[model samples]
Target: LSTWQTFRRLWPTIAPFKAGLIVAGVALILNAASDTFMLSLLKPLLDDGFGKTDRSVLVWMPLVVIGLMILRGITSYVSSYCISWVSGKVVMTMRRRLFGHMMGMPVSFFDKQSTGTLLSRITYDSEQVASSSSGALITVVREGASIIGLFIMMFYYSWQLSIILIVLAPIVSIAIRVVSKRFRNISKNMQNTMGQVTTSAEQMLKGHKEVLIFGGQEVETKRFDKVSNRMRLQGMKMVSASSISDPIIQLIASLALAFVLYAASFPSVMDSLTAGTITVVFSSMIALMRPLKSLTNVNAQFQRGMAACQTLFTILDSEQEKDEGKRVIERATGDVEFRNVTFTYPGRDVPALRNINLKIPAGKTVALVGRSGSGKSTIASLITRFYDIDEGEILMDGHDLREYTLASLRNQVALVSQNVHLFNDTVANNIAYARTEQYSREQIEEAARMAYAMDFINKMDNGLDTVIGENGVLLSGGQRQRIAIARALLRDSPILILDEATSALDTESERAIQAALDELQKNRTSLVIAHRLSTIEKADEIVVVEDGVIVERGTHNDLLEHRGVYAQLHKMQFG
Candidate 1:
C-alpha cells in the first residue's frame, strides 16, 4: 500500500487525540514562523545597529531575538509533548486492537501464523507504527512549515534569486521520490526478516530443554545464525538506502544554493540588494537546507512506519471466524452427532476425518482410540467446531451445530487435552479461570477436590492462592494435568472432552484420578480420545479409527472377540 493509504487507516486510532494534535500543530507552525521571523530581524540588525551607537536599536534587537528564542523553546516543548502523548496513546490502542482482533480469528488463521510473528506485531510493530504517527509527522509539520516560511522570506528579500532556486525543485523532488520508493521496499523486507529473527529465537528458547538434551546447541545456533544474518543484511540495506538519500538530497540543495549565489553576484542583481537584504536572503537560503535534510530523512522512518502499519492492518482486516448462528442456548442437552461428516484441515489436501458417523448420547461416555495422527483428536475438535466439516452436518441436541452461536456452543464444552495451558496466576484463580464472577473459593476447592489436586495444593505455602510460574512450570506433569482437570471440572460444561487427559500421569496417579474422571464424566456427554486402551475399556462405546476412517467400533469385549484393529490395539497395550 502507498504511505498515504496506509496512513489513512490510523485516523480512527488517532481521532480521539485530535485535540492534542491540534495544539501540537499550532505550536509547531508558530515555532516555524518564529524561526523565519528570527532570520527576518537580521536585515534590521545588520543595517540599523552595526555602526550607529543607537541605544534603542542595540537594546531592542538582542532582547527581541532572545525573547523569540525563549518563545521557540516553549513552543517546541509543547509540540513535542503533545505529539508524543497522542502517539503513545495510538500505540497502546493499536496493540490492544491487534490482540483482541486475533482472539476472534479462525483457527486456520493461527495455523498459518507463527506465534513469534503475532508477538512481534503487538510488541515491536506497534511501536514502529507510533513512530510514523509522531516522529515522521513532527518532521512533516515542523520542517515543512520551516521550509515554506524560509522560502517565503527568501522570495520577499530577492524574488529573482528565489526564482532561480525554485527551478531546481523538480530535480530535488524527483530524487527524493526515487529514494522514498527504495526505502519502502527495503523497510518491508526488514520488517519480515525481523519476524523471522523473532521466530527463530522463540523456537530455540522454547525448546531449550530439547536443545540441551539432544546436543542441538551447535545445530540451533547455526540455524539461528542463518536467520539472524539475513535480518542483519536487511538492516544494513535499509541503512544504506537511508544514508545515501541524505547526501544526494543535500547535494541537490547545494547545487541550487550555488545557482542562487551565481545569480546574486550579477551586477544588475547586486544593484537592488543592500547588505541587509543580501544577508537575509543568503541566511534564509542556508537555513532552508537543515529542514530540507530533515524532510528527506523522515521518509525512511515514515516508510518503515507505513510498512509496519500495513502488516498490522492486514491482521486487523482479516475475516473473523464465521459466527452466523442466531440461536443462543443457556444450556445444552449435550447430545452430539456427526452425520456423514468429512473434513480436511486448512491448507492440507488430505482429509483428517472421512465419512464419519457417530452419536454421543447425553450423559453417556464415548471413547475414540487410534494410532497417532489417526484423527482421534480431530473428532473431539469437531465437537467444539474448531473447524467446520467439508461435507455433511454435526448436530447438537438434534439441531445443526452451526445453528448455535459460537460462544453458546463453546460454552457447552470443557476440553482437557494432553497439552495443558495454565496462566501464571494463583492455583484457585487458574481453576476458576473465565468464570471468576460465578465461582467462589468454595466452588474452586470443590473442583480441585474432584480432580484429586488438593493433596498437593494443600501443602503449598499459600494453598490455593500461591502463585504458579508461567504455564504452571513450578508443577510436575501429573500436577499440571490435575489442575487442568480441576479447571475443566469447574467449567462444568455439559460436553466433556478428555483427549489423553491422563497421559502425563504415572500408573498410580492415573489410577488415582481415573476414579475422579469417571465421576466427573458421569452426567456429561464425554468424548474420550485416548492412547491407553485400559482407560476406554469401561466406556459405554469405543470406536477404533485409522487414517481418518472408522475401522471398527464396539464394546471392549466385542472388539476383542472380532479380533480387528481395536482388538490388536488392546493386545499391544495389555500384553
Candidate 2:
C-alpha cells in the first residue's frame, strides 16, 4: 500500500533498461512539443496567413506545419516502440526471479499454496507490474508533458482565459482524487478474482476425467459459472468507474467553457480579446480536455499495477528454505537412526510422529506397516529431511543429519513412492535422471533391465529414445513404477525409500514388479512404508505404527506369535 516503497522496489528491475527508457523519454518530450507547437500555429494562420494581404506567409507556413507533423509521427512511433520493449524485458525478469525464488522455497511454502494461484502469480501478477512500469509511466509522462505545453499555449493566448481555467483546476483535481480511490479498491479485488478464475479452471481441467466418469459436467459447469460471474461483475464495475469518471470530469470543464463564453458576450470582454486571441484561447481550453481525460484514464491502470507490484514483492521477500549446514560430505554410508524423534506438520496441533526411536543399519531392509495416517510415511519424509523433527535428532552415518549440506544429504537417498513422478522425456533420459551422476546408454539400459522395464521399453518404436507423456501417462501403472525403480537404480544412493510402492497395483502387476523392486533394494538401507503385510514378510525388522507411535517391533514371525497390531493387520489382509 505504501506507494513510495513499491516504486523503490520496482526500480531495480527497470534500472537495467535505462537506455530504452531514456530514448522513450526523449521521444515523448519531442512528441509533446510537436503537439503544442502545432496548436500554436493556428493563431498565425488565422491572423497573418489569412487576414494579411500576403500570399507569401501562407505558402511557407503550410510546409512548416506539415514538417512538424512528420516529426510528431516519428517521435510517437519511437516512444511507443521503446516503451513496449522495456515493458517486455521487465516482465521476463520479474517472472524469472519469482519462479527461481519459488524453486528454493521450503516445502511448507508450497503446502500452503495452490498450483493455479502460483501459476497466476508468475503470469498475471508480473504483467500487472509491467503495465504500471512502462505502460502507465509512458502515458503519465507523455500526456503530462502535453498538458504543460497546452497550458503554456493557453496563457500566451489570453491571461484572462488562463486564469479562468486555473480557477476550475481544484474541482477537476477533486474529481480525479475520488475516482482514483474507488479504482484502487476495486482493482485489488479484481486481481484476486482473476487468480480465482485461473484456480477454478485449473482444478476442473485437472479433474476432468473424474468429472466425466462421475457425470459431474453440470455440477462443475455450475461451479465454474459462479467463478466466471464474479470476474465479469468485477470487470464491469471497473469499466463503469472508468467510463463514468471521464464524462463527469469533462462536464466540469464544460461548465468553465460555458462561463467563459458567457463573459465574451459583453463589450468589456470583447474589447480585451481579439478574433485571433479568442479563437486560440477557446481552442486551447477545449484541447486540454483530451490529455486531461488521458491522465485520469491512466490513473486506474496505474493503481492496479501498484497493487500487483505489492503482491509480487511480498512473495519475493518470503524466507527461503533454511540451509545453514557448512559440512559437505561427498557420500553417506546409509546408517540411519531416529532418536526419540517427534514431528508435527506446519499448522497442525497434533504430532505426526511422537517420541519415536529406530535404527536402520546399512544394507538392511526395515518395514513400517500401519493403517493410513499412522505415521508410516512420515518416517520416510523425515529421513529425506522434507521436514525437520521438532524434537530429538535423525542421524545418518552416525552424524547428525542437520550437519550435512542439503545437496550432499539428498544425494545419498533415492525415493520411489506409489505416485511415481516422471518428467516428459525420452525413456533413456528418464531412467538416467539423477543429479548426482550422469549415466551412459549401457548403464541406463542395465538399470532398466534390473527394474524389469526393458521389455516394455524395447517394444516402443524408438526404444530407449521414445518420449513418454507427462508422468508416464503412456505407461501402465506397473510400467511406470518400473521406470521409477530404474531411475533409483541409476541414482544408486545408499538410502532408499519405498512408500506404498506396490500398494496401488493389482496382484498380477504387483507380482510382476516384485522381483525388480527386490533387485533395486539390494544392499541399500531401505525404509518400506506399506499397508500390505505380505510384501514385508522377510523384512529384517518390522515396526507396527499406530496413532503416531510404534506399538510393535520384531521379526515377522515374532510379531505374529505375539499377536500384536502387525499380526492383526496380517490377518485382515491375508484372511
Candidate 3:
C-alpha cells in the first residue's frame, strides 16, 4: 500500500481514543499560542521598560512575563502527557485485537507462517504503529503549529521579509516527500529482515543441543549474520537519507534568514522599524529553522509507522476460521464414519486422500497401519477436523461432522500424539489443561497414575506442582508422552486418537505403559495410527493403507492369513 493510505488505516485502531486525541490537540494549540504571546510581550518589554525606567511597569513586567512562561510549561506538560497516554492505549488496543484475530485464524494460516514472524508483528510492528499514531503526530503538530505562529509574527514585523520564504516552499515539500518514501521502503525491509532474525535466533536457541551435536555453529552463525547484515544496511540507508535531508533544509532556511536580515539592514527600512521590532521578528525567523528540520524528521518517522501498519493490517484483513455450524451437541456418541472422503492440502495438486471410506462403531478400535506419507496422520487430522476434505462427508453417530458446533465437537474428542506438546506450566496444570474446574486434584492425580507418569512426578522437587519448561523440555521423551496421555485420560472424551503415541518410547518404556494405554482406550471409540507391526496384533480390526487408499482391512490374524499389504508391512517391521 502507498504510505499515506497505510497511515490513514491506523485511525480506526485509534478510534476509541478520540476524546484523548482531542485533549492532546487542545494542549498542542495552547502550547504554540504561548510562544506567540511571549513574542508579543517583547513588543512592550523593550519599548516601555527601557524608555523611561517606568518604576511601576518594571515590577509588573517581570511578574507578567514569569507567569506566562510558567503557563507555557503547564501547556507543554499537558500535551506530552496526553500524547503518551493515547499512544499507549493505541498499542494496547492493537495488541488485544491482533491476539484475538490470531487465535481464530485457520490451521492452514499457521502452517504457512513462522511463529517468530507472527510474534514480531504483534510486538515490533505494533510499536512502529504507536510511533505513527502518537510520536510522529506529536512532533508534526507541535512543530508545525510553532512554525505557523512564527510566520504570523514575521509577517507582522515585515511583510516583504515573509515573501522570501514563499520562494522556497516547494523545495521543502519535494524533499520531505522523497525522504518519507525512502524511509517507508527501508522500514519495510527492516521489519521483514527482523522477522528472519527472530525466527533464526529462536530456532538456534531452542535446538542448541542439535547444533552442538552436529557441529553446526558456523553454519548457523553465517545464516544469522545474513539477516543481521540486511537489517543494518536498511538502518544505515535511513540514517544517510536523514543526514542529507537535514543540511539541505537548514541551508534553505539560512539563505532565507540572510535575505530578511539584509533587507532589514537598509537605512530606509530602519526608519520604519525600531530595534525592538527587528529583534522580535528575526528571533522567530531563526527559530523557524528548528521546526522545519523537525518536519523532515517527523515525515520519516510517520512513514516508518505506515510501513508497520501495512504489515499488521495484512494479517488482520485475513478471513477467520469458519465456525458457523448451528448444531450443538452436548456430547457426541463415539461412532465415526468417513465416506468416499477425498482431500488435498491447500497448496498441493496431488490428493492426500482420494475416494476413501471407513467406519468404526462406538467403542471399537481401528488400527490404521501404513508407511510414511501413506496418509495415516492425515486421517487422524481429518477425524479431528483440522482440515476440511475436498469430497464426501464424515459423520459422528449419523450427524454430519460439520453439523456440530466446533466447540461441542472438539469437547468430545481427545488426542495423544507422537510429538507431545506441554505448556511451560506446572505438572498439575499441564494435566488439567482447560479442565482444571471439570476435574478435581484427585482426578488429575489418578489419571497421571493410570498413564504411569506418577513415578517421575513423585521424584520431582515439586512433584505435581513442578513447572515444566516450554513443550516439557525439562522432561524425557517418554515422560512428555506420559503427561500427554494423562491429559487425554483426564478429558475422558468419547473419541480418542492415539496417533503414534508410543512411537518415540523405548521398547522397555513402551512395554511398561502398554497396560495403562490399554485401560485408557477401553470404552472410547479409538483410531490408532502406528507403524509398529506387533503393536496392533490385537486391534479389533487392522486396516493397511497404501498411497491414499485403504488396501486391506481384517482382524490382525485375518490380515496375516490373507497374505496381503498388511502381511507385507508386518514382515518388514517384525523381520
Candidate 4:
C-alpha cells in the first residue's frame, strides 16, 4: 500500500487516543500563539525602554514579558508530555496486533522468511513509526502553528516585508524537497542493510563457539564488516544531502532579512513605522524563520519515516491465509484420509507429493519409511495442515479438512518433531503449554511421567519450576525431545505425529525413551516418520515412499517378504 494509505489504515488504531492527541495539539497551538504575541510585544517594550526613554514603562514591560515566557514554557511542557504519551500508546497497540497477526501466519510463511528479518521489522520498523508519529504531529502543531501566527504578526507590522519573506519560502522548500528525495532512498537502503546485518549477527552469535573452534573468526568478521560498511555509506549519503540544504536555507533567510532592513530605511517607511513596531516586526520575522527552517529540515526526517512505514505496511498488507472454513469440529475421531494429493514446495520445479492416497483408521499406528527427501515428513506436514495441498483434498472424520477451523483441527493433533523448540520458561509452563488452563498440576506431572521426563525434571534443582533456556538450550537433545513428548502427551490429542523424534538421541536414550513412546501410543491414531528401519518393525503397517510416491505398503513382516523397496531400505540400514 502507499504511505498515505498505510496511515489511513492505521488511523483506526489511533482513534481511541484521540483525546490525548487533541489536548497535546491544542497545547502546542497555544504555546506558539503566546510566542508570536510576545514577539509582537517586543516593539512596545523596545520603544519604551530604548527609543522613548520611558523608565517606568521599561520596568513593567520586562515583568509582563517574563510572565508570558513562563506560560509558554508550561504549555510547551504539556504539549511534549501529551504527544509522547499518545505516540507510545499508539505504537503499543500496533505492536500488539502485529504480534498476533504474525503468530497466526502459517508455518510456510516462517519457512520462507528469516527470523532475524522479522525481528528487525518488529523492533526497528515499529520504532520508526513511533518516532514519525510523534515528530510529524508535533511539527504540524508547534512549528505549523508558530509559522501561521508569526506570518499574521509580520503582515500586521508591515505588509511589504512579509511579502519579501514569502518569496524566499519556495527556495527553501525546493532545497528541502531535493534532500528529502535522497533521504527516502537512503533510508530504505539503510533498513535493508540493517536486516542483513541483524541476520548475519544472529547466525554468527548463535554459532560463535563453532566459529572459534573452526578458526573462522576472520571470515565471519569480514562478512559482518561488509554489511556494516554498506550501512555506513547509506547513512553518510543522507547526512551529506541534509548538510547541503541547511546552509543554503540559512543564506537565503539572511539575504531576505537584509532586503527587509534596507527597505525599512527609507524616510517614507521609517516615519510611518514606529521604532517599537519595527522591533516587533524584526522579532516576528526571526520567529517565523525558525519554524520555516524546522519545516524544511523536517522533510528529510519525514521521508525516512515514510520509507520505514512502507516496509512495515507491506508486512501488514500481505494476504493472510484465508479462514473461510470456520466449521467447528470439537472432538475429532482421528479418521484421516488423503485422496489424490499432490504438492510442490515454493520455487521448486518438482512435486514433493504426487497422486498420493492414504487412509488410517482411528486407534492405529502407521509408520512411513523412506530415504531422505522421499516425502515421508511431507505426509506428516500435510496431515497437520502446515501447507494446503496443491491439488486434491484431505478428510478428517468424514469432513473435508478445509471445512474445519484451523484451531479445532490442530487441537486434535499432537506433533513431536526432531528439532524441538522450548521457550525460556519453567518446565511446568512448557509442558502445560499444549493445553494451558485446562490441565491441572497432577495431570501435567502424569503426562511428564509417561514421556519419561519426570525423572530428569525431578533431578533439577527447581524440579518442575526450573526455567528452561530458549529452545531448551540448557538440556541435552534427548531431554529436550522428552519434554516435547511430555507436552504432546499432556495435550492428549487423538492424532499424534512423530517426525523422526528419536533421530537425534543416542542409543541409550532411545532405548530409555522407547518404553515411554510405547505407552504414549496406546489407542491413538499415530503417524510415525522413522529414519531407522528397525524402529518400525512392530508398526501395524509400513509405507515405503520414493520420489513423492508410495512404492510399497503392507504389514512390516509382509513388506519384508516382498523383497522390494521396503526390504532394500531395511537391508541398507541393517547391513
Q: Which candidate has the top score in TM-score?
A: 2
State the TM-score for model 4.
0.73
Two-way lDDT contest, 3 vs 4, winner: 4
Question: What's each prediction's TM-score?
Answer: 0.74, 0.76, 0.73, 0.73
Error of 1 at 215 (Å): 54
Top lDDT hit: 1
Candidate closer to the true structure by lDDT (higher is better), 1 or 2:
1
By TM-score: ranked, best first? 2, 1, 4, 3
Error of 2 at 34 (Å): 4.4
The reply for model 2, stretches above 4 Å from the true place, is 34-77, 168-259, 262-277, 293-304, 434-438, 470-473, 501-503, 507-512
Candidate 3: worst 10 consecutive residues by lDDT?
501-510
Off by over 4 Å in 1: 1-10, 37-73, 156-279, 293-311, 330-333, 505-512, 561-563, 567-575
Residues 1-575 of candidate 3 have per-residue lDDT tens digits of 37887766666777887888888888888888787778767667676666666776667878888888898899888888888888888888989989998996888888888888889989988877886657787887888888888888878876654565455556656766777677667667667766776676577568778889998899888877876786677678757755665566677657656765676677756565766676676677667778888898987777777877887888797887778689777666788888888999887687879878798998888988777668778888878778888778887878886776677787778887757777888889988678677678989888888888888789878878898776556887677667778888887688998877346435466764676678788877888886655558768877778887988878988888898877676667722
- Give a tens-digit lDDT track for model 2, residues 315-396: 9988887787788776678888888887998877877788888888999988887776788777877777787778788887
lDDT for 317 (candidate 4) = 57
Alpha-carbon RMSD of each model: 13.4, 13.2, 13.5, 13.0
Clashing pairs in 3: none
Candidate 1 lDDT, 1-575, residue by residue in tens: 38888888678878888899999999999999999999899887777778566666777987898899999999999998998889888888888888999898888888788888889879888888887658888899999999989988888887876676677667767877887787777778777767867786677679877878888689888887887787778778778866876787678768866876787799967777887887887778779888978988998888888887888888787789889789887778888888888899988887778888888889888777877668877777777778888888888888997777888888878887657787788887878667788787888888888889988888878888889886556787677767778877888688888877347435466765676677677777888886665567778898877897888878888988898877676667722
- Candidate 1: Cα lDDT at 8: 81
Residues 302-399, candidate 4: write the lDDT tens digits. 66776777777778857566565777766678888888988887656778899887899999878887777688878888786778887888888898
**Worst lDDT window (10 residues) for model 4?**
501-510
